[PDB]
Amino acid sequence: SGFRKMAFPSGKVEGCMVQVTCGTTTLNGLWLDDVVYCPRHVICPNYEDLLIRKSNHNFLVQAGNVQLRVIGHSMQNCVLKLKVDTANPKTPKYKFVRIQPGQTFSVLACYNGSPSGVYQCAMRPNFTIKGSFLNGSCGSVGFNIDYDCVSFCYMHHMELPTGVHAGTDLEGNFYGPFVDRQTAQAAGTDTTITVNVLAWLYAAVINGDRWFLNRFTTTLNDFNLVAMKYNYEPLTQDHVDILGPLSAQTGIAVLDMCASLKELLQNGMNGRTILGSALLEDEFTPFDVVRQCSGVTF
Amino acid sequence: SGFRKMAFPSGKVEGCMVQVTCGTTTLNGLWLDDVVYCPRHVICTSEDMLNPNYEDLLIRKSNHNFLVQAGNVQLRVIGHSMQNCVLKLKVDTANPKTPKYKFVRIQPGQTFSVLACYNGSPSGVYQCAMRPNFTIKGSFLNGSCGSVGFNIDYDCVSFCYMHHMELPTGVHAGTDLEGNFYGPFVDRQTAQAAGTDTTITVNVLAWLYAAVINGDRWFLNRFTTTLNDFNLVAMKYNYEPLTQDHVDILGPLSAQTGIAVLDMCASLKELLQNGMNGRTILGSALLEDEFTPFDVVRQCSGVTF
Ligand SMILES: CN(c1ccc2cncc(NC(=O)Cc3cccc(Cl)c3)c2c1)S(C)(=O)=O
Ligand SMILES: CN(c1ccc2cncc(NC(=O)Cc3cccc(Cl)c3)c2c1)S(C)(=O)=O
Ligand SMILES: [Cl-]
Numbered sequence: 001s002g003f004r005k006m007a008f009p010s011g012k013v014e015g016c017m018v019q020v021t022c023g024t025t026t027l028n029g030l031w032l033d034d035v036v037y038c039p040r041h042v043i044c045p046n047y048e049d050l051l052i053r054k055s056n057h058n059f060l061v062q063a064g065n066v067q068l069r070v071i072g073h074s075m076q077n078c079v080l081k082l083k084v085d086t087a088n089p090k091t092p093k094y095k096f097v098r099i100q101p102g103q104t105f106s107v108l109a110c111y112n113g114s115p116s117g118v119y120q121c122a123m124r125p126n127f128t129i130k131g132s133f134l135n136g137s138c139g140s141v142g143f144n145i146d147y148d149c150v151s152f153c154y155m156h157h158m159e160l161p162t163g164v165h166a167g168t169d170l171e172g173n174f175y176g177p178f179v180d181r182q183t184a185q186a187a188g189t190d191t192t193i194t195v196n197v198l199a200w201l202y203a204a205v206i207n208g209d210r211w212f213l214n215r216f217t218t219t220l221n222d223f224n225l226v227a228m229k230y231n232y233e234p235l236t237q238d239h240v241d242i243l244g245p246l247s248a249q250t251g252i253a254v255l256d257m258c259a260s261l262k263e264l265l266q267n268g269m270n271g272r273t274i275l276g277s278a279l280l281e282d283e284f285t286p287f288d289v290v291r292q293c294s295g296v297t298f
Numbered sequence: 299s300g301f302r303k304m305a306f307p308s309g310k311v312e313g314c315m316v317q318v319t320c321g322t323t324t325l326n327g328l329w330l331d332d333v334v335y336c337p338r339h340v341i342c343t344s345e346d347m348l349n350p351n352y353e354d355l356l357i358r359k360s361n362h363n364f365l366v367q368a369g370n371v372q373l374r375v376i377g378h379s380m381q382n383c384v385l386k387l388k389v390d391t392a393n394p395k396t397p398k399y400k401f402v403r404i405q406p407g408q409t410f411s412v413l414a415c416y417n418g419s420p421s422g423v424y425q426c427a428m429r430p431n432f433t434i435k436g437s438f439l440n441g442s443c444g445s446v447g448f449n450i451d452y453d454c455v456s457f458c459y460m461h462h463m464e465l466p467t468g469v470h471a472g473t474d475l476e477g478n479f480y481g482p483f484v485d486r487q488t489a490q491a492a493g494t495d496t497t498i499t500v501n502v503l504a505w506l507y508a509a510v511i512n513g514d515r516w517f518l519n520r521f522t523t524t525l526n527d528f529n530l531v532a533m534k535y536n537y538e539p540l541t542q543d544h545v546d547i548l549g550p551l552s553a554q555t556g557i558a559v560l561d562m563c564a565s566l567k568e569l570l571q572n573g574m575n576g577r578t579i580l581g582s583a584l585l586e587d588e589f590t591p592f593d594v595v596r597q598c599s600g601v602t603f
Binding site: 002006012014130131133134163207273276278279292296298 | 299300301302303304305306307308309310312313413414415416417419420421422423424425426435436437438439441442464468469470512513578581582583584597599
């Protein structure tokens with residue numbers, strides 16, 4: 001019993017964090033094999049013009065109390081790749097994957113190449129993340145684990161004026177319509193991840209919280225008409241299919257759980273809580289709920 | 299900016315998790331130097347659990363009865379002893395991944411990270427607090443016994459909790475790393491219930507200071523209170539009494555924001571009376587009590603927005 005916001009064990013990622021310094025700027029880098037990946041804004045814009053003026057010895061890479069030797073450098077989108085002389089002996093089995101909004105991942109927040117905390121979060125539908133980052137956290141990474149393979153999905157680049165965060169995948173492509181520069185940028189109007197709220201309502205049922213269940217059902221179209229009015233993302237037939245296992249385990253059909261969500265949206269919680277929360281939680285995917293209510297290890 | 303429930307990086311603890319098997323029971327152990335620490339109930343059958351005599355059950359065991367597995371490597375048990383409710387298995391190999399560590403016993407209200415494990419394999423990490431009733435609101439399934447709670451302040455891992463059991467309400471009970479239970483619990487299947495739980499007042503106040511540091515002031519008011527009047531109101535909402543020690547501990551946050559502790563106590567009194575009225579504080583519609591004053595200072599900036 002119990003339901004917590006749970007992150008993946010961070011050990012395989014901790015063994016990859018390094019400190020990257022260029023001039024007066026210091027941030028974090030990800031050392032995999034003989035390459036250190038970090039935000040290209042470490043050289044700060046015309047990034048190609050700024051990069052051509054830098055030599056290998058300008059980039060100081062520190063792995064713990066050991067200085068790494070930069071033997072090459074190249075840029076891929078908004079990510080700088082520093083070729084080093086030494087391959088990381090702690091390099092785990094890994095992939096670079098781009099995630100979609102609604103998907104969740106763990107963030108290992110770092111300062112000066114030293115990991116300080118791990119938290120779980122979701123890629124919002126507006127492509128921002130509601131993280132917890134201070135100055136010096138640039139280069140901190142987001143990841144998931146599949147068996148023994150670490151899938152790197154996010155690298156932190158900046159904070160927006162509302163306190164939310166923007167970053168790229170590990171190939172340097174930003175999530176969202178953001179750019180790596182000091183300019184007027186704002187996060188779009190955010191929406192609630194509907195498939196994730198439904199998964200969390202299934203997790204509440206599994207944990208013995210059934211007060212919100214009702215005898216009613218709904219059509220997918222009527223649910224989407226109601227959901228669009230509360231700034232909830234549309235629920236597709238794919239989402240319904242993905243909720244299949246949880247629906248079969250609890251005995252509550254997905255459209256039956258949608259009618260519960262409709263009543264919660266139109267009438268509120270009425271002083272009650274679900275899994276210790278007075279708000280509808282959308283940062284647990286259907287897979288996160290199955291994994292936490294099954295005991296999958298890494 | 300931003301405020302998340304943040305756990306310590308778990309790498310230093312992952313390198314210590316092993317699987318301990320005795321008969322048909324399998325659970326987790328913590329391998330530090332040449333000793334594996336695990337719940338002593340690993341020697342019990344489900345029948346033994348009502349009234350087990352651990353001394354009587356342990357004297358019947360030999361070293362080769364305990365199977366310890368570290369990854370895909372079998373460790374050799376060369377000795378065994380019981381210290382309170384933990385079993386200490388002396389092994390023939392020191393863990394090369396042993397971090398710098400201490401065993402610390404925590405007080406209610408204190409927070410820590412939990413590395414939940416099954417079969418000696420870590421599956422997840424979360425942050426939680428020792429409730430005033432000495433239970434933890436964890437997320438544990440069968441096989442999680444032996445999973446540990448820790449803090450990593452600087453480079454030293456302070457182990458503070460080892461998971462032993464789930465109570466009928468779904469909450470969890472465990473010991474420090476010296477085998478002493480937190481709370482009036484016993485490692486027996488006898489009728490045991492968690493006492494009435496209360497809100498950790500000093501932690502809610504710390505979290506209201508974190509909200510002010512992050513630019514939110516909607517809940518503040520022009521009032522102050524005496525410590526006694528605050529406690530009379532707080533106890534009516536099942537909030538722990540705020541002691542002068544708690545007031546002293548909130549000193550740094552009070553000086554950083556410019557809001558006196560008893561003035562923040564007055565905002566808390568008002569929040570309990572009024573509710574939130576459709577508003578949130580740090581993305582939460584409830585008053586959060588699982589961030590200590592130390593967690594807020596560690597996570598938040600030194601410059602108030
Ligand atoms: C220095 N400060 C912070 C605070 C939290 C921060 C959290 N994450 C990243 C930061 N870094 C940038 O956003 C740098 C930047 C600026 C423009 C374009 C890019 Cl791509 C990158 C953060 C900076 S403060 C208190 O707001 O003055
Ligand atoms: C109710 N069950 C669970 C579920 C979550 C559990 C979470 N943590 C620990 C468990 N183990 C015990 O509590 C074993 C025990 C029993 C009595 C006294 C002690 Cl010291 C230890 C858990 C057992 S189940 C599904 O039937 O396996
Ligand atoms: Cl303590």
